[PDB]
Amino acid sequence: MLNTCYRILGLKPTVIFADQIMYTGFAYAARSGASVGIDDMVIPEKKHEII
Amino acid sequence: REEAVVWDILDEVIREHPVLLNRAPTLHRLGIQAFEPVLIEGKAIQLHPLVCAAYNADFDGDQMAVHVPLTLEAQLEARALMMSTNNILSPANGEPIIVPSQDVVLGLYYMTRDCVNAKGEGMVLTGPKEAERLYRSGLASLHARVKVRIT
Amino acid sequence: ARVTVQDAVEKIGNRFDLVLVAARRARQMQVGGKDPLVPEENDKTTVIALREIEEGLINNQILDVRERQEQQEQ
Amino acid sequence: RQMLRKATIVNAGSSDFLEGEQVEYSRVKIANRELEANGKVGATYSRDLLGITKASLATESFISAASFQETTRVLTEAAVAGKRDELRGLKENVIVGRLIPAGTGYAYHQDRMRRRAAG
Amino acid sequence: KPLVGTGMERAVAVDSGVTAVAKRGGVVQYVDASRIVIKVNEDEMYPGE
Amino acid sequence: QDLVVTEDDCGTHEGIMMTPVIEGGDVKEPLRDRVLGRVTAEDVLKPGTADILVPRNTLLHEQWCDLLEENSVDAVKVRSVVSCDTDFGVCAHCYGRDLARGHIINKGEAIGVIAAQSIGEPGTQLTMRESSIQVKNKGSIKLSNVKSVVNSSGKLVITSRNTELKLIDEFGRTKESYKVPYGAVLAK
Amino acid sequence: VTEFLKPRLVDIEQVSSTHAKVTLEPLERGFGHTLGNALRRILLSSMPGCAVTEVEIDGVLHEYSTKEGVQEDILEILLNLKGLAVRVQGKDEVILTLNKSGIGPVTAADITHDGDVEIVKPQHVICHLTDENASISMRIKVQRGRGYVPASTRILVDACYSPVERIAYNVEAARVEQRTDLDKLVIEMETNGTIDPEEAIRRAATILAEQLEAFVD
Amino acid sequence: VTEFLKPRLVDIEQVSSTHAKVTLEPLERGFGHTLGNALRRILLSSMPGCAVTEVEIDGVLHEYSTKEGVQEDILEILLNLKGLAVRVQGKDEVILTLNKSGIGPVTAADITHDGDVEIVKPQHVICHLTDENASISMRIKVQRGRGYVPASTRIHSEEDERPIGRLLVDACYSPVERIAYNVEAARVEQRTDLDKLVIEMETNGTIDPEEAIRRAATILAEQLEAFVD
Amino acid sequence: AEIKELLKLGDLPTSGQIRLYDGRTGEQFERPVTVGYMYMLKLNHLVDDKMHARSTGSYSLVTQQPLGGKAQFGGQRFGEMEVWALEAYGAAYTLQEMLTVKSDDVNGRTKMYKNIVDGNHQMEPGMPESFNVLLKEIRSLGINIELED
């Protein structure tokens, strides 16, 4: 998308979009959260036989 | 004595005076950039997460170099050529350098994502108040199949 | 402050003579004897000269014509 | 393109009976000699490429090709040459601090050249 | 102490030689914030001491 | 330390031929990027006879790439370094843009200065570490001047060790070479 | 000890009648930021105002209807009616109906200009141009409520009581004498209209101050 | 407004001498959270309370030296006392003075607690003297303040002052420093269902909880109106 | 599994995930997250220890440059890789200043200070002052074919 924008639009809108993108990305990242834990990794037990 | 007028003069002069900051280990031309300084009440300079890759470092301990364009021509060259607002694409291969590789992309993806169909998945709208609903209630990003007239 | 410098580049093209013209304009604007044709907004001579060039009023020809006219008027 | 220079030759061609002459130098000599004055002045040259360390020795500015890895022998050599660095490379204009013929300095040097045009 | 442990810390401090150890002592009588007086019991109080 | 921008054009018909990198199994690199930031010689012609594709001195801004792709043209004779009839620096008709300069390289530039590091850039590299033949898809032979001689079987033996095929499926685009020695026998 | 500062510089620069940004002076720490959060949450999740809610047109009541030459489907007309902050002075929700010729140029003034029923922009299209010259009744209603309520559960088109379109807040830094820890507030927005910025800010501040007399008593 | 139903505080509970829990009548959604936020801010940060500004002892200067018998040193004594808090009257710049002789446990009874210097938690671990000849007497200036600050700030105001012996002391000064605002949906039957707010406020004794509620919400109105211009 | 049982015994989620209330806008954040108390410790390298600045300090005994085993006005000298890259920028003016201001020969320091105070912001190319000194050399000027033009 960035490449296509630079192709079509120009430099100033590109900078504006990139900055707003960094901001909005931080915003959504703080919004969802999406933690991680041990259960976030669930090991299949099949190899226990296969191996 | 460090009067307030001293700080005001410093700000006013710097208000028209940008600076250049550069990385210690030197590999690419992206290792030095020109930015419009903003005074900081900290101890270590904060760089826009934009060129974090362009610095070829990873928020680990490093002192960066500071350069001031004493010549007027020096200022013209830095603000013109050494401008990061000028440096967009990886000039080596031409690839666009400016590319969010940090969780900015993660949020961009999570925004356009939906498990199966969240609360109010079937809601249909026009655009001005989608964030009004999402911030308070009514719909989520993890919702699917929400009709919307797109301009 | 001026974020991106693209209009002056389109007015110059060579991307190198623009710096020289802006410098030879800002030098005069800072030393005196000249008046900014563009209404300033509490900005230094560099950005003022650059915006005046990007507007399409200052280049490597009008400045020389004005200098010759001022030297001949002495 | 850098990886070759100082071409080898066979025929003097009224130019010179030597070897290892800059391919561009030979070409300029032939153009200024064959078409201009003596087309029969035709010197046969065999262009070649070699290793980085060696062609490192091959430079025009006597000040250059001196600090590279060593100069004492180069000092003897340039003194025998009695040659002039002539302000050749951009690194040379840096050594003098002169307008490195690049960016604004180029035109500035060119303006210097403009000043060097009439004198 | 950081909450999570491995069990090596106490023994390591013992071998660290940096803390203060009680050699053949029975009861600590006078404790100043610099002077620690411990009354060694006669079983641990050797004769002539 | 030598490279510098001084010559706007070469004016020399001398050029180099660029073709897609059909390396190993297939095109390791399509010929859609290798010269987009290049200006060729008068070699630009459409695949149809007496049909031209582009002029002598032309820079493929963006659409000449697509137009040539329409012709399935893989190689062209184009302007490049060294051949720049300048003998010091090069043609700006032989340097390109190759950076954010959406315009061609400006004069007084030193591309080699920008060079000499791009090779040195990824120092994160690593150092210190005719029988089985299969075709990719539908294609032609294109033995590329392979000497054929009378063989014991009902075919033409390769009298030349320089026998190299090429897969032509529907147009000039190739898939694989699959060169085989003089000891190979044309099974197809 | 208790002398509390407030945002004094309330200078606001408006790009148009539908684009503007106001700023707050450097106040105490945590006041610009938390105050901006509260103000935005207010202007969105609760905003006093009146507008259209739905309509009753002649024909079949199904949404998947035919244009039949109107070239304006039910969604097009309903959307062009709902975003208009159709206002009634002091009365409750007012019903209006319309019938005109087939010019095609659909605006907001052709409705029966009632004593209380009014529209801020009379050129606001309520439908798309057609290919014939028939007449029909719009029969829409303009309602006033608290905050904003949807039409999916409150059937039928849309009820835009809260007159807010796009709102954001930003925090800047300002010093006093040596310490720059002034987290000053500003809010930037784009809108439809009919709410004066200082007037809307006054209404918000008034509701907040009039209700905050109880927890402190 | 439109049937704004301005509520009032009700059933404000005080479990202990160092906290309180205030319940309130119901209010609307989309505002109760913001109101509770503003209230917690104005009660905790801009919080008029008391702390310790100056310390002194004739034998104990700024250097962190353990007093005779006292197990803790000057920095250590500062730490151990910091676990408590002290009271000054409507007038600030009060002074408490912890003085004790013997070898028994060190607590706050033998400390300057007046009608304008008040003590509630009087048995802290205060590094009791261990030598009989010791008799400790440290004096801490307990004044009133609002916001966090270090000790180097008073260097300019006490340069010819703060001579060799006077200890200048800092603080973090958030005299509430803990207040929880919880907005739920209850206490509304006849009208629209409404959100009632609960404030679990807590101090070290410096000020009263309902007093902090009144101060914070007064500031809430004050800065709330300021948006008018 | 023992950890999950303890969390149940500790009146904590076995997964440990839990919702959170925002500290700035107070919106409930979806995807309940797990939290804990992790051990933290600081590094010997200190930010105050790292901080350093200098624009005009004291020079050392060799080559008139600033140094002398003293942590005063410390200032990493430019890098040869850095110098090559700086040339690659083509900022011949800036590079010419770095080699024309940024070092040791305080001789034109007075000129630079006077120009800056006047706001002149001007410099003279002159000669590597040290190559003018290398002419002082020149085999004692023995090599002076220097055809200055």
The residue to which tokens 């070897």 are assigned:
D19
Which sign does the torsion angle of CA B114, B118, B120, B122 carry? positive
The residue to which tokens 């340069």 are assigned:
H159
| Contact map slice: I 26-85 vs B, CB within 8 A | 27, 30, 45, 47-48, 50-52, 76, 79, 81-82, 84-85
- In chain C, which residues touch D (CB < 8 A)? 16-17, 19-20
Closest CA to C30 of C8, C49, C3: C49
Q: What burial class does residue F58 get, using C-beta atoms within 10 Å of its C-beta: 0-12 exposed, 13-18 middle, 19+ buried?
A: middle
H185 and H90 in a common domain: no
| Amino acid identity at D20 | G
Interface contact flag, G148 B132, Cβ < 8 Å: yes
Cα B3 to the center of its chain, rounded Å: 33
Q: Count the Cβ atoms, other than its own, within 10 Å of residue C74.
A: 4
G179 and G196 in a common domain: yes
Q: What are the tokens at G30?
A: 């945590």
G58 and G39 in a common domain: no
Interface contact flag, I24 G33, Cβ < 8 Å: yes
Give dist(CA B136, CA H33) in Å, integer: 12
Domain boundary among G161, G185, G207: G161
Closest CA to H95 of H65, H58, H131, H51: H51
Q: Count the Cβ atoms, other than its own, within 10 Å of residue H120.
A: 14
G6 and G25 in a common domain: yes
How far lies H41's CA from each of D78, H29, H173, H179, H181, in Å?
79, 20, 13, 9, 10
* Annotated binding residue B62: yes
| Amino acid identity at B97 | I
Closest CA to H220 of H4, H8, H39, H7: H39
H154 and H103 in a common domain: yes
- Please give, one letter per residue, the 3-state secondary structure of H57-106: CCCCCCCCCCCCCCCCCHHHHHHHHHCCCCEECCCCCEEEEEEEECCCCC
Indicate contact of G with B: 3+ CB pairs under 8 A.
yes
Q: Are E25 and E40 in contact (CB under 8 A)?
A: yes
Chains near A with 3+ CB pairs less than 8 A apart are B, C, I
Give dist(CA E36, CA F162) in Å, integer: 96
H169 and H105 in a common domain: yes
CATH number reported for the structural domain that contains residue F152 in this entry:
2.40.50.100
> What is the per-residue burial (b if ≥16 Cβ within 10 Å, else e) of D83-106?
eebebbbbbbbbbbbbbbbbbbbb
Q: Count the Cβ atoms, other than its own, within 10 Å of residue H38.
A: 26
Interface contact flag, D105 I96, Cβ < 8 Å: yes
Q: Are H23 and H36 in contact (CB under 8 A)?
A: no
- Stretch (H or E) spanning F112: helix F111-114
Torsion, Cα of F176, F177, F180, F186 (10° steps) = 80
Q: What are the tokens at G204?
A: 């918000």
State how far residue B150 is from chain C, nearest Cα, in angstroms: 31
For residue D65, the chain F residue with the least C-alpha distance is F1
Give dist(CA H189, CA D80) in Å, integer: 109
Give dist(CA D106, CA F5) in Å, integer: 10
Q: Are H115 and H59 in contact (CB under 8 A)?
A: no
DSSP bridge partners of H180: H200
DSSP bridge partners of H184: H196
Residues of G in contact with I26 (CB under 8 A): 37
Domain boundary among G161, G185, G203: G161
| Contact map slice: H 127-186 vs G, CB within 8 A | 144-146
Phi/psi of residue H57, nearest 5 degrees: -160, 140
Q: What is the DSSP string of chain A?
A: -HHHHHHHT-SHHHHHHHHHHHHHHHHHHHHH-----STTS---STHHHH-
Give dist(CA H66, CA I96) in Å, integer: 61
Task: Count how many domains chain H has.
Answer: 2
The residue to which tokens 């200048």 are assigned:
H168
Q: What are the tokens at H39?
A: 């209230």
Q: Which residues contact G30 (CB under 8 A, 6 or more apart)?
A: G183, H41, H45
Range of the domain at F138: 131-188
Residues of D in contact with C20 (CB under 8 A): 104, 107
Q: Which residues contact B17 (CB under 8 A, 6 or more apart)?
A: B37, B68, B75
- In chain E, which residues touch H (CB < 8 A)? 30-34
How far lies C72's CA from each of C57, C60, C68, I1, in Å?
22, 19, 6, 95
Cα G38 to the center of its chain, rounded Å: 18
H18 and H64 in a common domain: no
I25 touching chain G per CB within 8 A: yes
> What is the per-residue burial (b if ≥16 Cβ within 10 Å, else e) of A28-43?
bbebbeebeeeeeeee
Give the Cα-Cα-Cα angle G44, G47, G51 (nearest 5 degrees): 115
Chains near B with 3+ CB pairs less than 8 A apart are A, C, D, F, G, I
Closest CA to G91 of G120, G115, G111, G56: G115
Considering the domain delimited by D52-118, tell me its CATH architecture: Orthogonal Bundle (1.10)
Closest CA to F59 of F110, F94, F10, F12: F94
Q: How many helices (H) and strands (E) does chain E have?
A: 1, 2
Range of the domain at G167: 1-48+162-217
Give the Cα-Cα-Cα angle F120, F124, F128 (nearest 5 degrees): 100
Give dist(CA H224, CA G6) in Å, integer: 9
Q: What are the tokens at H41?
A: 């801010």
G64 and G128 in a common domain: yes
Interface contact flag, C14 F107, Cβ < 8 Å: yes
- In chain H, which residues touch I (CB < 8 A)? 33-34, 37
Give the Cα-Cα-Cα angle G198, G202, G205 (nearest 5 degrees): 135
Q: Count the Cβ atoms, other than its own, within 10 Å of residue D5.
A: 20
For residue H40, the chain I residue with the least C-alpha distance is I23
Q: Which residues contact C58 (CB under 8 A, 6 or more apart)?
A: C21, C25, C37, C49, C52
Cβ-defined contacts of F57-64 (< 8 Å, 24+): F57/F9, F57/F93, F59/F104, F60/F35, F60/F36, F62/A7, F62/F36
G157 and G196 in a common domain: no
Give dist(CA G59, CA G56) in Å, integer: 9
Angstrom resolution of this structure = 6.8
Q: Strand H135-145 and strand H49-56: pairing? A: antiparallel
Q: What are the tokens at G77?
A: 């007309």
CATH number reported for the structural domain that contains residue C45 in this entry:
3.90.940.10
Residues of C in contact with A11 (CB under 8 A): 4, 6
Q: What is the DSSP string of B73-115?
A: HHHHHHHHTSBTTT--B-TTT--B-----STHHHHHHHHT--S
Q: In what order do the strands lie in the sheet with G19-23?
A: G12-16, G19-23, G182-190, G166-174
Interface test with D, best of B29, B71, B73, B76 (most D CBs within 10 A): B73
Chains near G with 3+ CB pairs less than 8 A apart are B, H, I
CATH number reported for the structural domain that contains residue H12 in this entry:
3.30.1360.10
How far lies G15's CA from each of C38, F184, G20, in Å?
22, 79, 5
For residue B38, the chain G residue with the least C-alpha distance is G173
Give dist(CA G71, CA G129) in Å, integer: 6
Cα B146 to the center of its chain, rounded Å: 31
Q: Where are the alpha helices (DSSP H) in D65-102?
A: 72-81, 90-95
Task: Count how many domains chain C has.
Answer: 1
Interface contact flag, A35 I33, Cβ < 8 Å: yes
Count of CA atoms in the C-beta half-sphere (13 A) of G26? 10
Q: Where are the alpha helices (DSSP H) in chain D?
A: 23-30, 52-57, 72-81, 90-95, 103-118
G213 and G192 in a common domain: yes
Q: What burial class does residue F32 get, using C-beta atoms within 10 Å of its C-beta: 0-12 exposed, 13-18 middle, 19+ buried?
A: middle
G128 and G63 in a common domain: yes
State whether residue C11 is helix, strand or coil.
helix
Which sign does the torsion angle of CA B98, B104, B105, B108 carry? negative
Chains near C with 3+ CB pairs less than 8 A apart are A, B, D, F
- Stretch (H or E) spanning B133: helix B130-136
Range of the domain at C36: 1-74
Give the Cα-Cα-Cα angle C25, C28, C30 (nearest 5 degrees): 105
Q: Are F140 and F167 in contact (CB under 8 A)?
A: yes
Give dist(CA C58, CA H159) in Å, integer: 59
Give dist(CA G144, CA G146) in Å, integer: 7
H79 and H142 in a common domain: yes
Closest CA to F110 of F122, F98, F124, F120: F98
Residues in chain D: 119
Give dist(CA G22, CA I140) in Å, integer: 73
Q: What is the DSSP letter of I102?
A: S
Interface test with H, best of E29, E32, E36 (most H CBs within 10 A): E32
Phi/psi of residue F35, nearest 5 degrees: -135, 15
Interface contact flag, B76 C4, Cβ < 8 Å: no
Give dist(CA F119, CA B135) in Å, integer: 50
For residue I27, the chain H residue with the least C-alpha distance is H33
Q: Count the Cβ atoms, other than its own, within 10 Å of residue H133.
A: 8
Q: What are the tokens at C37?
A: 């044709």
State whether residue B69 is helix, strand or coil.
coil
Q: What burial class does residue I111 get, using C-beta atoms within 10 Å of its C-beta: 0-12 exposed, 13-18 middle, 19+ buried?
A: middle
State how far residue G52 is from chain B, nearest Cα, in angstroms: 16
For residue H27, the chain G residue with the least C-alpha distance is G211
Q: Where are the alpha helices (DSSP H) in chain E?
A: 8-16
Phi/psi of residue D115, nearest 5 degrees: -65, -35
Give the Cα-Cα-Cα angle B9, G5, G41 (nearest 5 degrees): 105
Q: What are the tokens at D101?
A: 């013929």
How far lies G58's CA from each of G66, G75, G138, in Å?
13, 15, 8
Phi/psi of residue H53, nearest 5 degrees: -105, -40
Q: What are the tokens at C45?
A: 């001579």
Q: Where are the alpha helices (DSSP H) in I1-149?
A: 2-9, 47-50, 80-89, 92-98, 109-117, 129-141
Closest CA to B56 of B39, B35, B33: B33
Give the Cα-Cα-Cα angle F168, F173, F177 (nearest 5 degrees): 60
Interface contact flag, I25 G33, Cβ < 8 Å: no
Interface contact flag, G180 B39, Cβ < 8 Å: yes
Residues of D in contact with F108 (CB under 8 A): 101-103, 106-107, 110
